[PDB]
RNA sequence: ACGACGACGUUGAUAGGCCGGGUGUGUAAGCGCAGCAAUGCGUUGAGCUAACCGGUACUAAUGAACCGAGGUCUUGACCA
RNA sequence: CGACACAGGUGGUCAGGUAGAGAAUACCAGGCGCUUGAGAGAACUCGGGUGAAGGAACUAGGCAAAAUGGUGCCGUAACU
C-alpha cells in the first residue's frame, strides 16, 4: 500500500483515485 | 501591421498598383532612368503575361516583348524611376503568374495566343 | 536538418494511412491506446473530420466518409457527439498521456471523448 | 532462494554478483538496480528472494542479515544451432550460469 | 551522430488546439436554366489547403529522490 | 539433389476466370503474410530515377545512359 507522491490506496497494476500515477504524471481527478 | 510587412510601405511604397498586369495584357512601361546624360524622355515596349510580383516589394514581369531581337529584364514597380501605366488588350485567359510558352515560340497565330 | 514538419515514424506509406483508423477508434469507442506520437497527430485526424461535419448537409456528410471508412460510427458522428459538442469550438476530443505499459515501453494515454 | 534452470552464460553471469558479495542486504539493493548489464536481472531476482524465505521459515532478522557467499560456477552446456555469418552450420558450445547467494545474520 | 550545448518548467506561451494575420491554388456543394453527352454555362474573381507569425494558456511542463569533500600542514606583515 | 527449413537445380496436366494487339499490367477463385526487431531527417556505397549551358571534350572503344521505337496513309536510294 506504498503510493509515490501521495499514500494510501495503490496497485502496481493501474493508477489511483487521487492524482493517477505509474511513473507518468498527467491523469486528475 | 506586423513586423514584417509593417517595415515596408516606405521604400516602393504600395502605390495604387495598376489593374494589370494581368494575363495577356500587354502595358506599355515607362522609365526615367539615366544611364547616359541624365535627360531621358519618356519611352515604350509591348509586354504580354508571365506575370510576377508579391505584396510590399512587387515587379513587373517577363517583358516579353518582340521588338529588337528579342526580350526579357525588367525593373522592380514600384522604383525611384516609375511613373503611371495605361491599357492594351482586353484580358485573355490561361494561368496568370507563372506562364512560360510564348519564347521560344513567338510567331502571328503563336504570340499572343495561349 | 530544417523545421518540425509530420513524423513519419515508419516510411511513406505506412505514414493518410494509419491516421484513418485508430482515428474511428475514438468513435467508435472512448478510449485508444497507442504510443508517444501515438494519437497527438490523430488529433487532427479528428477535427479535421469534425466540423465541416458538424451541420448536417450533404456537403459535409460525404467528407466524413472519405477519411474513415465507416458507415456505423460516420452517422454517430452526428444525432451524436455533435449535435453535442454545440456551443463549444475547439477541444473535441484531447487527452492527457499515460505512463507506458509493458511489452514496448512506450507511453500512452486514451485519447477518449470529452 | 538460490539458482536452478536458465540459459545465462556463467561468465557474464557475475560481476554483478560482485559489489553485492559484501554485508549489508540494502547494499545489494540499492546496487544492481543499474548495471546496464543483462547480468542485473535474474540475479537480482535472487539475493532479493534470498532474504525471503530467510524471514519467514530458517527465522531471521532483515536489519542484520548480509551477504556471505555468492559464486557463479557449473552448466551444463549444450549444442545450439546458431546460423551464423553469411551462411553456415555450427553448434554453439554454449553454458548456463550458477548465481548462489546467502543472506543469513552476520 | 553517442556525450555535450542552450531555453523554459505557472513568478510559464515551450508545444498543440482555436481565431486572426501573412501565403499556396483557382472557381465549390447544390440548384436553376445549362447540354443528347463529354462536361461547355450562370450562380462564385467562389472553395480547399499550409513543416510561418501573433493573440490566446483552453489543453500539456508533477512529485520526489539523490551525487555530496567536510574549511589537510610546516610557516612572512597587517589587524585585535 | 546440392553437408543445413542454401534467393541454385528439378518432368507432365490446368495457357478461354474478367477488361487488350497476345498464355503482358490491375483484379474474383484459391493460397499466403515462414525470407529477426526498436529509436535518430550524419560523413560515409551499393541499387535507382536525370539535371540549367555545352555536350564524348571522358574513353582502347560513347562501355554506360539515352534516344527512335504501336497503328493507318503518302513515299522510299546504291546494290542484287
Known amino acids: 500500500l506504498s503510493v509515490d507522491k501521495t499514500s494510501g490506496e495503490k496497485h502496481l497494476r493501474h493508477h489511483i483515485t487521487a492524482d493517477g500515477y505509474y511513473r507518468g504524471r498527467k491523469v486528475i481527478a | 501591421s506586423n513586423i514584417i510587412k509593417q517595415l515596408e510601405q516606405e521604400q516602393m511604397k504600395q502605390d495604387v498598383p495598376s489593374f494589370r498586369p494581368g494575363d495577356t495584357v500587354e502595358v506599355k512601361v515607362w522609365v526615367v532612368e539615366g544611364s547616359k546624360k541624365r535627360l531621358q524622355a519618356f519611352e515604350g515596349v509591348v509586354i504580354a503575361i508571365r506575370n510576377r510580383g508579391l505584396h510590399s516589394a512587387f515587379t513587373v514581369r517577363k517583358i516579353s516583348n518582340g521588338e529588337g531581337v528579342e526580350r526579357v529584364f525588367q525593373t522592380h514597380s514600384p522604383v525611384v524611376d516609375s511613373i503611371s501605366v495605361k491599357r492594351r488588350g482586353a484580358v485573355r485567359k490561361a494561368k496568370l503568374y507563372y506562364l512560360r510558352e510564348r519564347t521560344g515560340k513567338a510567331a502571328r497565330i503563336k504570340e499572343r495566343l495561349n | 536538418h530544417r523545421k518540425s514538419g509530420r513524423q513519419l515514424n515508419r516510411n511513406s506509406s505506412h505514414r493518410q494511412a494509419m491516421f484513418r483508423n485508430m482515428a474511428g477508434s475514438l468513435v467508435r469507442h472512448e478510449i485508444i491506446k497507442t504510443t508517444l506520437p501515438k494519437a497527438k497527430e490523430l488529433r487532427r485526424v479528428v477535427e479535421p473530420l469534425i466540423t465541416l461535419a458538424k451541420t448536417d448537409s450533404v456537403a459535409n456528410r460525404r467528407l466524413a466518409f472519405a477519411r474513415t471508412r465507416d458507415n456505423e460510427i460516420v452517422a454517430k458522428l452526428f444525432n451524436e457527439l455533435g449535435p453535442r459538442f454545440a456551443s463549444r469550438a475547439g477541444g473535441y476530443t484531447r487527452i492527457l498521456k499515460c505512463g507506458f505499459r509493458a511489452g514496448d515501453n512506450a507511453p500512452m494515454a486514451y485519447i477518449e471523448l470529452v | 532462494a538460490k539458482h536452478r534452470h536458465a540459459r545465462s552464460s556463467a561468465q557474464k553471469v557475475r560481476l554483478v554478483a560482485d559489489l ?84 543469513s545474520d552476520r
Open chain 4, 20 to 103: 553485492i558479495r559484501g554485508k549489508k542486504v540494502s547494499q545489494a539493493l540499492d546496487i544492481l538496480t543499474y548495471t546496464n548489464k543483462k547480468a542485473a536481472v535474474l540475479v537480482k531476482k535472487v539475493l532479493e528472494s534470498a532474504i525471503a524465505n530467510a524471514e519467514h521459515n530458517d527465522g531471521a532478522d532483515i536489519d542484520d542479515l548480509k551477504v556471505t557467499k555468492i559464486f557463479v560456477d557449473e552448466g551444463p552446456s549444450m549444442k545450439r544451432i546458431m546460423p551464423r555469418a553469411k551462411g553456415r552450420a555450427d553448434r554453439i558450445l554454449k553454458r548456463t550460469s550458477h548465481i548462489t547467494v546467502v543472506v
